[PDB]
Amino acid sequence: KCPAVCTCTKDNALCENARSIPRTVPPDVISLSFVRSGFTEISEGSFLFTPSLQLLLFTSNSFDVISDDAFIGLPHLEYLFIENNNIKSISRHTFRGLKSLIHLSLANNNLQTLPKDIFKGLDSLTNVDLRGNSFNCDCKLKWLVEWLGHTNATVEDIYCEGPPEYKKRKINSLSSKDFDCIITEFAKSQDLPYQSLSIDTFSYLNDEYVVIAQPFTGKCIFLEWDHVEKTFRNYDNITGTSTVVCKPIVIETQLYVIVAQLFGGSHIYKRDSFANKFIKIQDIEILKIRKPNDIETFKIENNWYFVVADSSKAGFTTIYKWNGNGFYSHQSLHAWYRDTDVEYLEIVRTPQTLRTPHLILSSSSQRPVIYQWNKATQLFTNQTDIPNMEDVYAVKHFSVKGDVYICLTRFIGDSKVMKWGGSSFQDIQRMPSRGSMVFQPLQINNYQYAILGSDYSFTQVYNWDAEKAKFVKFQELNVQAPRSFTHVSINKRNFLFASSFKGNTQIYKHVIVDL
Amino acid sequence: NVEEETKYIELMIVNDHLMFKKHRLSVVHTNTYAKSVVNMADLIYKDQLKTRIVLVAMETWATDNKFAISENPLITLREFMKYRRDFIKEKSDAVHLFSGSQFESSRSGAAYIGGICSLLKGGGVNEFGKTDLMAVTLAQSLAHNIGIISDKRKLASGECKCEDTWSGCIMGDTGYYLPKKFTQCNIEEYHDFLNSGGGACLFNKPSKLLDPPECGNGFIETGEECDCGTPAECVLEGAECCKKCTLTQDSQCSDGLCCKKCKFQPMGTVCREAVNDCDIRETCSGNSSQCAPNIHKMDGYSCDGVQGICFGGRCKTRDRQCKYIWGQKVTASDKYCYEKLNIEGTEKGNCGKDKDTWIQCNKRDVLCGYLLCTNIGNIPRLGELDGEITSTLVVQQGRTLNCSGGHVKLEEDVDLGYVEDGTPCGPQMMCLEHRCLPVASFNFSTCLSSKEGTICSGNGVCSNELKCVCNRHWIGSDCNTYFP
Ligand SMILES: *[C@@H]1O[C@H](CO)[C@@H](O)[C@H](O)[C@H]1NC(C)=O
Ligand SMILES: *[C@@H]1O[C@H](CO)[C@@H](O)[C@H](O)[C@H]1NC(C)=O
Ligand SMILES: *[C@@H]1O[C@H](CO)[C@@H](O)[C@H](O)[C@H]1NC(C)=O
Ligand SMILES: *[C@@H]1O[C@H](CO)[C@@H](O)[C@H](O)[C@H]1NC(C)=O
Ligand SMILES: *[C@@H]1O[C@H](CO)[C@@H](O)[C@H](O)[C@H]1NC(C)=O
Ligand SMILES: *[C@@H]1O[C@H](CO)[C@@H](O)[C@H](O)[C@H]1NC(C)=O
Ligand SMILES: [Ca+2]
Ligand SMILES: [Ca+2]
Ligand SMILES: [Ca+2]
Ligand SMILES: [Ca+2]
Helix, strand or coil: CCCCCEEECCCEEEEECCCCCCCCCCCCCCEEEEECCCCCCCCCCCCCCCCCCCEEEEECCECCCCCCCCCCCCCCCCEEEEECCECCCCCHHHCCCCCCCCEEECCCCCCCCCCCCCCCCCCCCCEEECCCCCEECCHHHHHHHHHHHHCCCEECCCEEEECCCCCCEEHHHCCCCCCCCCEEEEEEEEECCCCCCEEEEEEECCEEEEEEEECCCCEEEEEECCCCCCCCEEEEEEECCCCCCEEEEECCCCEEEEECCCCCCCEEEEECCCCCCEEEEECCCCCCCCCEEEEEEEECCCCEEEEEEECCCCCCEEEEEECCCCEEEEEEECCCCCEEEEEEEEECCCCCCCCEEEEEEEECCCCCEEEEEECCCCEEEEEEECCCCCCEEEEEEEEECCEEEEEEEECEEEEEEEEECCCCEEEEEEEEEECCCCEEEEEECCEEEEEECCCCCCEEEEEECCCCCCEEEEEEECCCCCCCEEEEECCCCEEEEECCCCCCCEEEEEEEECC | CCCCCCEEEEEEEEECHHHHHHCCCCHHHHHHHHHHHHHHHHHHHHHHCCEEEEEEEEEECCCCCCCCCCCCHHHHHHHHHHHHHHCCCCCCCEEEEECCCCCCCCCCEEECCCCCCCCCCCEEEECCCCHHHHHHHHHHHHHHHCCCCCCCHHHHHCCCCCCCCCCCCCCCCCCCCCCCCCCHHHHHHHHHHHHCCCCHHHHCCCCCCCCCCCCCCCCCCCCCCCCCCCCCCHHHCCCCCEECCEECCCCCCCCCCCCECCECCCCCCEEECCCCCCECCEECCCCCCCCCCCCEECCCCEECCCCEEEECCEEECHHHHHHHHHCCCCCECCHHHHHHHHHHCCCCCCCCECCCCECCCCCCCHHHCECCECCCCCCCCCCEEEEEEEEEEEEECCEEEEEEEEEEECCCCCEECECCCCCCCCCCEEEECCEEEEHHHHCCCCCCCCCCCCHHHHCEEEECCCCEEECCCEECCCCCEECC
């Protein structure tokens, strides 16, 4: 009562060069083995009518696929060894239906992949052997990493054979780092009917509000999250002529907004307590501040300051200290220069360990210059220029771990990222771009992006690579004339605003994908 | 109409050594860069002032810096005009300097106001900058040379407005957002400058560019017998005449004031009338398609009767000086006011200052002293008021006249409120350094004369280029021959 292809003793069966699986075994057969059989594939739902099996092994065979539920009908199956074969892929529910399985070995058959949670359903498992296979390590072997540390069953060590970047590395020794298995995408949730220039946000009573500077019609737009079936809605306007920058400041639960124009442009507002109407407080002199370009807000040592980038040679860059009632002139910088941008950044200047506030302002034809804060005189004293780059329009800053880097913008040429050393800035990455009016890094949930706009071609968005220590090309955005990019964080919802000078401005939604 | 004619500025640019070194110490780079600056400034002037700027000559100093450059743009302007007057012999309507050094001043450049078509005042000085930036600087310097002013009573009060709120105008202070358009008041100030007989030499249309020829640009170069503003705008004038920048046999004139339906003008037909008593009206030669180069009366000719004497086609009197300094509503005071003020030697009337002392004015130099005007406003139309205003009331036989004056500052040594040089104090008299002097002390000349004691034989008018414009019934260089 034993097939002629197989050599069979009373309780054991050894089959070689079998074309198809015989489904009829002697009742007292316990163990079964297949060696170099001519099987194309395992039979779908095979090994029924033979429940007496306890041990089953396959060696030196050739399999393209092992179908799901291939081992159903084996309630007494305990040991299973499929090794020393050549297999490409198996299906996940293959081992499903075997709760009596204890020992399993897929070793040395040169497997490059395994489907997520292949081992579910085997709760009696004790020993598993996967050694001797070429392991290409990606998100599949990430779930595998999840399973190795969580299973009480013992598993001998296995090693990554791919990618060549990760060679001869223990799969047991891997963490969540260097696995960006999550995909991030930016898709436009909303398009706004108006062309924009600058955007900034502020938080009041758990409500987040966003300010937009519309230059031509002169509208300083204040919008809010409607929270009722609406993504964004404009709730208030401030009307001025040739508005450039609308920067809000909140000091001690009080809302103040600075608007800048080129004629009678210096203005400081404060919101009315009742009806949320904005009321103008101060008018800074027209004669001293002419043709403003950029405005940055910064607070230093329990004191709020305020800086305006004067784009005119006649006017000077000015910092304003704030007493109880309003802003008044504190210091002036860079006389008889055309200042394109100003930036505030706190860096660690050696040998000193704490951070020191610093200012970086860029001119038209001039190299950017840096000012070091001096506490004793309440001034910025040490003034140095960063060498070997010209025609820098804007400089932005970001910090990764304990290092602080800067992104320097160039309209035509190499906009480049630099590392802050102990004394000066060090070259990190050179990135060519055309028509770039902005190079803005953004930090969103431990993800450092860097957006480089273009008034001519696509806006190039870059992502941070942790172990490559530089940015990498990430995505391409279609915005007419980008000028500023702003990160907006709602309750568990993340958005980005993209300015458009010659076209309608865009609102993108940040989405996170789990694969 | 003098406004409707599209004028042409013959510009010569001189690049110093610092500018040459910022341009890779290379001749081609400096040349192309300056050409581009002139290109942008000309793109501005073309739409605004109906005036083209053509660059016909350029010289760059790669050997050494010729003179002593200064951080003050005014000193650099003076010294540069000294270099032009003593060295530069090339013919041009204006000569500007492109300097690589930085000026420590509120201004990006300096140029003499209304100095166009002068040898001494015909220049300008601009500092280094980006392309569009130095295009603006050259635009406002040439605006100074062409008679445009930035400040005025109308602009200070608000009547003259720049209506670009996102960028200033050219005469205003320049920021990173650069101006593209003038105010209408600047336009009308230019038009008033031209209606006064100023800027005569700007009607010469350049036929030789120093760059390779191009068809369809509006200028006739070598290899082409005719040119149009553009193939699209040709249709207005010269579309019957010129195709592919070549004329058909029936036509020799593409376009111009003297060309009508592809025919020249009859000789002696008037293209442009005289704009004042200093200008001479020009007639079509019947040879060229453009009207004859602008020509005005020679210096020393009487204008506005005996009240003024012609300089550069422009009439200089004390009434026009009052109206120019303090606005159109101002009128010159009666002679009693000067005649009385000079004797006292007070602060209100005076003839000059040596060292914190007033000179007792002579009785002949009375009208060369402090300039006085009846109805005076609080602010000067140009420059800024040094000190405070002056008001002396004078009574004669019960008549009361508030004679008023002021000291107006442009340059440290240039002070308005003083009688301008060349202004007549008396018949056959003129004011120089606040003193009445005869005309024979000015070394005057007068075109070849055929008859005795008569300018151009008395049958014609002398020109600024020292050539006789005979009247009717007279021909020749001296106007001697008679032709009825
Ligand atoms: C064994 O499994 C338990 C949960 O059943 C877990 O708490 C423990 O960490 C595991 N031990 C090892 C060594 O994996
Ligand atoms: C606010 O500005 C928008 C355009 O930005 C305009 O359509 C709307 O009417 C304005 N609302 C008010 C109340 O002025
Ligand atoms: C700051 O350093 C710069 C050059 O690096 C120098 O010009 C300046 O004098 C320094 N300031 C002080 C206060 O020493
Ligand atoms: C015009 O041509 C005639 C000869 O036909 C000549 O005598 C005269 O001098 C020319 N005039 C000018 C201004 O070229
Ligand atoms: C005298 O001068 C004042 C200004 O100083 C002016 O307002 C007034 O009209 C003048 N008086 C006469 C009679 O011109
Ligand atoms: C001009 O006058 C000066 C003296 O003022 C005299 O030396 C010179 O010879 C004169 N020039 C001519 C051309 O007459
Ligand atoms: Ca900034
Ligand atoms: Ca000319
Ligand atoms: Ca041509
Ligand atoms: Ca004339």
